[PDB]
Amino acid sequence: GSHMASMKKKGSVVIVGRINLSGDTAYAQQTRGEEGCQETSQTGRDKNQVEGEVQIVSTATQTFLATSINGVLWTVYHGAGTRTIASPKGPVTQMYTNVDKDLVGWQAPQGSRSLTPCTCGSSDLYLVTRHADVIPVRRRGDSRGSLLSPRPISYLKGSSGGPLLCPAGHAVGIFRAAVCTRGVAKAVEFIPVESLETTMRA
Ligand SMILES: CC(C)(C)[C@@H]1NC(=O)O[C@@H]2CCC[C@H]2OC/C=C/C(F)(F)c2nc3ccccc3nc2O[C@@H]2C[C@@H](C(=O)N[C@]3(C(=O)NS(=O)(=O)C4(C)CC4)C[C@H]3C(F)F)N(C2)C1=O
Ligand SMILES: [Cl-]
Numbered sequence: 001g002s003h004m005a006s007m008k009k010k011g012s013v014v015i016v017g018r019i020n021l022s023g024d025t026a027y028a029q030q031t032r033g034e035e036g037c038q039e040t041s042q043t044g045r046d047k048n049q050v051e052g053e054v055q056i057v058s059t060a061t062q063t064f065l066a067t068s069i070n071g072v073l074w075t076v077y078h079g080a081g082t083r084t085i086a087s088p089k090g091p092v093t094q095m096y097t098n099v100d101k102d103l104v105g106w107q108a109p110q111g112s113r114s115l116t117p118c119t120c121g122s123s124d125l126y127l128v129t130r131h132a133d134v135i136p137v138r139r140r141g142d143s144r145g146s147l148l149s150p151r152p153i154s155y156l157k158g159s160s161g162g163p164l165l166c167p168a169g170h171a172v173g174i175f176r177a178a179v180c181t182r183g184v185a186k187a188v189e190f191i192p193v194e195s196l197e198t199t200m201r202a
């Protein structure tokens with residue numbers, strides 16, 4: 001048994017900033033501080049205006065990224081779980097959930113801009129981190145890519161759910177996991193956009 005009247009509810013995922021890719025310089029912007037993030041997580045009511053393709057998102061215990069592609073805000077299950085996302089009208093229930101792909105999605109917030117899925121078949125990719133670093137990544141397989149310049153894993157922590165982009169700025173995949181050998185990240189594993197398009201058309 002358990003005392004049901006006091007069972008708590010997990011809060012919503014909350015947008016706390018964005019990666020500005022609009023102009024000629026990539027940079028992170030914060031749109032909500034720690035206090036407002038916790039209040040907004042509990043209510044699920046986020047009145048802030050949303051802009052751009054890559055959002056910085058937070059729960060009470062984790063922070064990561066979320067990327068809009070074809071009208072869906074995508075992120076990783078290991079960050080969001082089954083949580084709703086805060087919105088101007090209250091919590092919004094997930095529209096996609098696939099733990100086997102480490103993938104979840106909500107309807108893209110009003111004001112967001114969506115990336116278009118890549119059709120160019122290029123293997124010269126670019127990973128966008130939560131610090132607005134644009135890291136060249138050579139595609140090595142359907143879901144893997146190697147860093148031209150390896151980095152300590154610390155530099156990629158908190159960027160799951162961010163995009164991998166082709167040279168034309170099209171979405172190639174969603175950053176999922178890192179290939180980590182003794183604290184150094186040599187390569188990345190991502191959800192291919194085609195897997196997204198299947199999840200959408202499924
Ligand atoms: C050693 C390592 C780097 C920690 C780990 N490597 C690793 O496992 O490599 C193997 C070998 C090649 C691919 C991968 O096969 C296993 C697949 C794992 C997975 F990803 F599909 C995954 N599915 C889940 C589904 C349901 C519930 C939990 C799940 N947990 C998973 O993996 C976990 C999570 C994932 C992670 O940390 N991702 C990143 C991130 O930033 N997160 S985060 O924002 O800070 C944060 C924790 C707030 C959300 C991008 C990498 C950054 F840190 F660089 N992990 C562990 C790793 O990357
Ligand atoms: Cl996949």
Ligand SMILES: [Zn+2]
Nearest residue numbers: 118120166170
């Ligand atoms: Zn492309």
